[PDB]
Write a protein that binds this ligand. Structure first.
Ligand SMILES: *[C@@H](CC(=O)Nc1cc2c(Nc3ccc(F)c(Cl)c3)ncnc2cc1O[C@H]1CCOC1)CN(C)C
Ligand SMILES: CN(C)C/C=C/C(=O)Nc1cc2c(Nc3ccc(F)c(Cl)c3)ncnc2cc1O[C@H]1CCOC1
Ligand SMILES: CN(C)C/C=C/C(=O)Nc1cc2c(Nc3ccc(F)c(Cl)c3)ncnc2cc1O[C@H]1CCOC1
Length: 307
């Protein structure tokens, strides 16, 4: 029981949207033009459980998390958000398997963990983290989305018990599979899987194995394998995320740091054939920040903004 959520739910008129085109099953492309303000805000449009998803998206503000611009009540309920032009990261990495480099992959890892740590501070358990629910604003800026299964926790409450509903098994932590328990530390597990998804350029977890065998696979000790491009340093972290003890997994704030240190020297932690040739994103604020210090300190210098 925390502070009054004082977020503003904004109701939007049908007459403000223009040039609506479909994306698939429902979500749409579109343009929002607020009352005669003469500006175009590109938007996505998704068509009472949906009103919970709205409450959440309405209530979150952070550079690596999608915010609801508003809802629309005409005919049926519609969620309006900023259009992310490059779509979901899962499709993006598949689409650019042979054009993605090591700096990008590590930059996204940081950005996601940055978003998730935020959600942890707001007491939200996402419950459906995966590369499909990470979207691309620009190639070097990704955001977390899709709070359809998200749940808020009390100040008191540490876990969330589920009543039975469809959840993707191959991202789920073991406690979630066996005991229907959800915690920030189960989202950590899912984050590990998401990193595995990126480091294998959009491969399918446990490809071939059905969902029924999963709980029993993980009980036996087996995990996802070490991606070819991953040094033991990176794989270690993934495996740490998939540990049986929820409290022994990394913590999203720790994951920021671990991945941020690697991002200084991506070619030391990922070995991508043709990485010399790949396109590089803009230097990170952190990587810039560090070069401005004395050479003696730079070994261990950390940008406080990621701490
Ligand atoms: C991934 C395809 C994909 O994600 N496409 C896509 C989504 C999207 C969203 N998503 C969204 C989710 C929840 C929600 F409440 C709202 Cl309001 C939106 N949001 C904005 N823009 C999006 C764009 C988008 O795509 C782009 C590519 C073509 O042009 C748009 C496939 N997995 C689902 C498997
Ligand atoms: C992440 N990497 C794997 C690939 C990097 C891709 C990238 O930067 N792409 C793309 C970058 C684009 C870009 N960049 C840009 C940058 C700085 C600026 F100031 C301005 Cl004004 C523009 N501007 C316009 N279209 C683009 C389309 C891209 O890609 C489309 C077209 C074909 O494939 C998808
Ligand atoms: C920064 N440096 C470290 C290297 C730069 C790399 C780079 O730009 N790469 C690559 C750049 C690409 C590019 N750039 C582009 C830029 C401006 C434009 F107006 C237009 Cl139309 C296109 N467009 C399409 N594919 C590309 C593939 C690249 O790399 C792939 C294909 C070969 O191996 C990996």
């Amino acid at each position: 029981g925390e502070a009054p959520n004082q977020a503003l739910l904004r109701i939007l008129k049908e007459t403000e949207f223009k040039k609506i085109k479909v994306l698939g099953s429902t979500v749409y492309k579109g343009l929002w033009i607020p009352e005669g303000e003469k500006v175009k805000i590109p938007v996505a449009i998704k068509e009472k459980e949906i009103l919970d998803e709205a409450y959440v998206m309405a209530s979150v503000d952070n550079p690596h998390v999608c915010r609801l611009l508003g809802i629309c009540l005409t005919s049926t309920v519609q969620l309006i958000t900023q259009l992310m032009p490059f779509g979901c990261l899962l499709d993006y990495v598949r689409e650019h398997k042979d054009n993605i480099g090591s700096q990008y992959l590590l930059n996204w890892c940081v950005q996601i963990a940055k978003g998730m740590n935020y959600l942890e501070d707001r007491r939200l358990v996402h419950r459906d983290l995966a590369a499909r629910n990470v979207l691309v604003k620009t190639p070097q800026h990704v955001k977390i989305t899709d709070f359809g299964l998200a749940k808020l926790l009390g100040a008191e409450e540490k876990e969330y018990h589920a009543e039975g509903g469809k959840v993707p098994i191959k991202w789920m932590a073991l406690e979630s599979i066996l005991h229907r328990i959800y915690t920030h530390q189960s989202d950590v597990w899912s984050y590990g899987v998401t990193v595995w998804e990126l480091m294998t350029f959009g491969s399918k977890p446990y490809d071939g194995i059905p969902a029924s065998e999963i709980s029993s696979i993980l009980e036996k000790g087996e995990r996802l394998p070490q991606p070819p491009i991953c040094t033991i340093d990176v794989y270690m972290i993934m495996v740490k995320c998939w540990m049986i003890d929820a409290d022994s997994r990394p913590k999203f704030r720790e994951l920021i740091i671990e991945f941020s240190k690697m991002a200084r020297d991506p070619q030391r932690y990922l070995v991508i054939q043709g990485d010399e040739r790949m396109h590089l994103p803009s230097p990170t604020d952190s990587n810039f920040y560090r070069a401005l210090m004395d050479e003696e300190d730079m070994d261990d210098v950390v940008d406080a903004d990621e701490y």
